[PDB]
Amino acid sequence: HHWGYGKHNGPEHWHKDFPIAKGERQSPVDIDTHTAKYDPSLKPLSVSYDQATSLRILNNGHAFNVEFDDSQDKAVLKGGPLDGTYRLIQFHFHWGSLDGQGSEHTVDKKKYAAELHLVHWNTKYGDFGKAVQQPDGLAVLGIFLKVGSAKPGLQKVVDVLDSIKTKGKSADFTNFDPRGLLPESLDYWTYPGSLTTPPLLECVTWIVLKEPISVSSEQVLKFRKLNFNGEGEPEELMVDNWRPAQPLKNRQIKASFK
Numbered sequence: 001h002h003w004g005y006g007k008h009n010g011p012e013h014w015h016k017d018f019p020i021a022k023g024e025r026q027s028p029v030d031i032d033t034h035t036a037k038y039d040p041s042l043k044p045l046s047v048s049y050d051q052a053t054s055l056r057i058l059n060n061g062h063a064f065n066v067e068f069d070d071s072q073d074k075a076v077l078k079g080g081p082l083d084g085t086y087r088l089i090q091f092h093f094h095w096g097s098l099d100g101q102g103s104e105h106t107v108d109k110k111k112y113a114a115e116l117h118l119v120h121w122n123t124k125y126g127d128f129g130k131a132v133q134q135p136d137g138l139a140v141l142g143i144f145l146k147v148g149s150a151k152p153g154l155q156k157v158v159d160v161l162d163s164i165k166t167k168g169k170s171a172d173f174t175n176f177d178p179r180g181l182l183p184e185s186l187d188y189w190t191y192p193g194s195l196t197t198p199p200l201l202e203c204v205t206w207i208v209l210k211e212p213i214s215v216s217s218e219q220v221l222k223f224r225k226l227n228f229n230g231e232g233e234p235e236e237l238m239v240d241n242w243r244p245a246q247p248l249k250n251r252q253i254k255a256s257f258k
């Protein structure tokens with residue numbers, strides 16, 4: 001597979017190798033704030049990242065992933081719409097060439113500069129690869145980035161990007177605290193959906209925070225200096241690695257807040 005974000009291999013092409021691209025619960029979607037209903041039955045959301053063990057950062061030719069030790073319950077997401085315990089495995093972002101685009105979810109058709117995805121899997125399925133085969137296998141916590149003041153808790157990430165410019169490069173990335181990437185409020189929207197990259201599997205409970213975090217123009221500019229290409233290949237800047245909104249179909253988006 002040779003998917004990407006360009007004219008010739010981008011999201012309008014994915015369905016030929018990954019037919020589920022045109023399925024019934026694809027992500028991302030537009031969150032219409034006037035149609036999402038408050039759901040009083042939602043339990044509060046529990047983000048327990050105190051014992052998080054980050055290990056490594058990797059440029060995969062599509063984005064960069066910050067990877068965690070998920071061999072025990074060290075950093076978990078519970079509550080909200082979820083049953084049981086979901087282990088943090090990795091986070092990554094999607095971003096734009098310009099500040100007016102980059103996020104995958106939109107809010108009343110508003111696009112943010114970027115979007116952070118913290119990816120967790122349901123420990124009842126034992127490993128990540130088994131979990132992505134289940135309709136409730138993953139919980140992805142999604143956080144909007146807007147350009148403004150600097151996010152101090154992001155700067156360790158920004159500063160390591162020079163060392164993983166090109167596809168296939170990785171760097172040690174221990175002792176990074178993902179709590180530093182969270183906004184103040186845990187108010188969220190939730191809906192059932194999918195992975196937003198191939199293989200596009202329909203295995204995700206999406207939990208999208210309402211409150212964006214602010215990052216600096218200098219921070220996001222450093223994301224835009226990454227490369228999709230490998231070392232010694234023609235330079236293609238890693239920008240616009242977002243999938244656009246997909247049809248909502250027969251789904252309801254629920255709000256945790258009034």
Ligand SMILES: COc1ccc(/C(C)=C/C(=O)O)cc1
Nearest residue numbers: 119132194195196197198199
């Ligand atoms: C089985 O291979 C996989 C590849 C990518 C992913 C993710 C986590 C994709 C995304 O962020 O949309 C999962 C499994």
Ligand SMILES: [Zn+2]
Nearest residue numbers: 093094117196
């Ligand atoms: Zn993502």
